[PDB]
Amino acid sequence: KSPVFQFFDWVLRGTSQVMFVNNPLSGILIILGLFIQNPWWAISGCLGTIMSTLTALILSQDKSAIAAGFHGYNGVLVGLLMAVFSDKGDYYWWLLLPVIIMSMSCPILSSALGTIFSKWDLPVFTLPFNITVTLYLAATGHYNLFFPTTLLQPASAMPNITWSEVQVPLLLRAIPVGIGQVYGCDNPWTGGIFLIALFISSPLICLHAAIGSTMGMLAALTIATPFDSIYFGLCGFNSTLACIAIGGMFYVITWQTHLLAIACALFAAYLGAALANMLSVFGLPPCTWPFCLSALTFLLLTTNNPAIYKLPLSKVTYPEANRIYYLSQER
Amino acid sequence: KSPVFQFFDWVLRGTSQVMFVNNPLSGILIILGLFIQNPWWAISGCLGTIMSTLTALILSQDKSAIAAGFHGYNGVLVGLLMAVFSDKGDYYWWLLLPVIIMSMSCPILSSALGTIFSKWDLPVFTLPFNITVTLYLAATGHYNLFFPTTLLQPASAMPNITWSEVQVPLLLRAIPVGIGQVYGCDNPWTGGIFLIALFISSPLICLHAAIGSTMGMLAALTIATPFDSIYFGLCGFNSTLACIAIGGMFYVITWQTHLLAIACALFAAYLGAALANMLSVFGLPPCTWPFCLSALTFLLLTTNNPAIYKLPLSKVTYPEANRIYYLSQER
């Protein structure tokens, strides 16, 4: 095996580890979906992942958690969110420069947070992306002269929501859109590609992703969010990530854990609305902060009943194998 | 004993554990005070506590720390602050719905923060309420269409404070008002009810509450806060909570700890002014964040002199019994 082939296998695993799925075929499907959405964003995300995992190599990280894509998944998101929020337009080639620098900052953060979380056997999640992208989008802002960003400002008037005009078909379509919005992509076709890409590896992740996107869609219909965000998918990427993380991966899948995951989707969606109203004061977007906060507060949660079992971090692979491992360890 | 009677004993203990006091008679007195202030807020707070402790049951928490009200005290505050900040008015029955949902989110947080703080033998304090109420009041905001909230905006002009017009009698009355404002209630009569309710169980908690409210009242007269907030009690609920927590409960009461508690009241009041000027940018209120921050930074504080002694968390009950325990353990 040529080492360059091994490295590209690593980057493909990284580009799908965002969905907690470690499978290069799902990675290539997700890359295809990104290119379907907008080739510029796909190029930016691939550059972000390449530089992130390369920096992980240079810093001489643990070689075990790079063949799992553990250091690339924070790069694809940095690239995609850097290039979806740039006001200069498409193929503004200069944007590739900070996308490099910030991509070199994901392993560092991913290391540091790890040492903070090691005391509680808790995963670093998508916090490294949040810190880096918040750093960039606040460092530059909308009025910057080299890398301006799209303007986000707090609501200043009561939204005009008419429940006569709700389109249920579009509202339903908010499920695959919510799945795809994790990567920044809103096209329903890329959402379908993502759902298929998850379903190839493990059905439970796909099921919990669909349930999470739906659950967030519903949670933002209770606090009367404007319908444009519902159709566009902005209210269903924190929810889906939280649902996947809590449902069957970090907890052995069980009906108790299933209800816990749905509750986590609720908490994550409401926290997403909160942080979106708060972080829009600075002009920042809610870039996968709510998922991180809700998943952390749902994994640190302590219970008595034996059904709610938190797998040791090393053992995690995917929900089916997690359940198989737990059943084996019971014997 | 009928189990329903036991559960209502639990909820009464929870409705008074806000004042660090574990006594069902004080709970019933505080409930009476709430109903004296505004029956709508009392109903909302009782619903919040009921659902919070019920969720603690469902999550199968430690049955020991529910007969102490440990999971209800974060529900009464959520209900009261949800229903004091609702712009729709009194008896807007729909408000009971989110008050349920958020009340089901207090045990979860109270568990999670516990696992974060267990490494330092530090109590979770009122942080669960802060997170939940901040989440709600930022998720909805003042312009929301289903559950609007009262508008809070940063100061935009120099306040007009005339020291000729200070009314000392009202200013003095800011002490019981400051005691009552912990629950959101500002009527002086409910403040008196609260002071009596504390004094029934343990005099030291009442004394430190009065001292803390006074100390915050004074601390906000040094930075020239507008007098309306002073009379209304907004500058004396963080201070009183901090003074109670540091004075005789988590530290064995001693004159050294007494000065430490007064200093903590000072730090908490100034931090309250700071967070109120900062958190008002988003439209959020300073909902018992300053007390939490100051009490944490005063309990993590490390000293050499043997007088400043931090009780192990399990042993805490109330200041007099704390002192008795320390004297016994000295022998």
Added chain:
Amino acid sequence: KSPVFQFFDWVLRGTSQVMFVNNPLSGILIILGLFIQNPWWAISGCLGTIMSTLTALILSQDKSAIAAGFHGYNGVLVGLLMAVFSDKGDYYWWLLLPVIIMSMSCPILSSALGTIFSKWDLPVFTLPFNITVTLYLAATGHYNLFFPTTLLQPASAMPNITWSEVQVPLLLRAIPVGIGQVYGCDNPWTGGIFLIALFISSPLICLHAAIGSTMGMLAALTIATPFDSIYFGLCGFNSTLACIAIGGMFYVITWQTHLLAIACALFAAYLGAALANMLSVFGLPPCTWPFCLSALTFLLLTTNNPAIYKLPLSKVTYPEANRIYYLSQER
């Protein structure tokens, strides 16, 4: 030795420990530089340090880490930043009052954060100053009536940067200015005094300070910061502090650690721009938050290669002695 002489030796060590340098001669040189800049700020800073270390005495802290100035360095910064941001002008004597109170709050915080960081063998850094000065500048604000502060507001229009008019000599002079801006002083002469004061004790700290100030100067020329801040030194005090902390002090100096320090200067400068655009919403300045955050995330960072070695906290003195200790321990 008269005890008052010992105490003034302590305060002189504290006034230079800001630059991670423990040498009373450097302390007296830095005091001289402060008096060269503006005598009012020097008086305020000396009062801050005196009261901070005095409070550390009263709280009966560890007598070992007061002859190193460990409790005074958070007081000089509180005084200097309190008195550089006061809108009332120079020799507004009333300002000395809160400068006392807040100076009595630095040991407390410095203790508390220590107990938080002890689990990770990480230094408390300049976080105590940040918390206290942010608390003050948000508690009072620009519209306060007793202690108003200078107005800081977010950018509302695209800056007009012309690269024809860049003055390279001034731009180069931004290096000593960046060194001096740690203490709030911008005069190039006080920057030179500071560079000399560092170079007296250990050349590596001076070298890393110059490199850090330069590296931040460059990092803020990439995101197109207005040139006034570049000349004035606002973009080079987080960078220099981070470079000193990571370069040779907390890591045994090596070329690997040198590149790590330069990368930390980059991350700290970009984070400084970010926090300055964010914290200016409240009206707060970026008071040595970026350095703290970047240095923490660069010390918690975990590597495999043996060159990147993190000294146990107790052993740290200065980079040359650190390297000598590491070489001795290798044998």
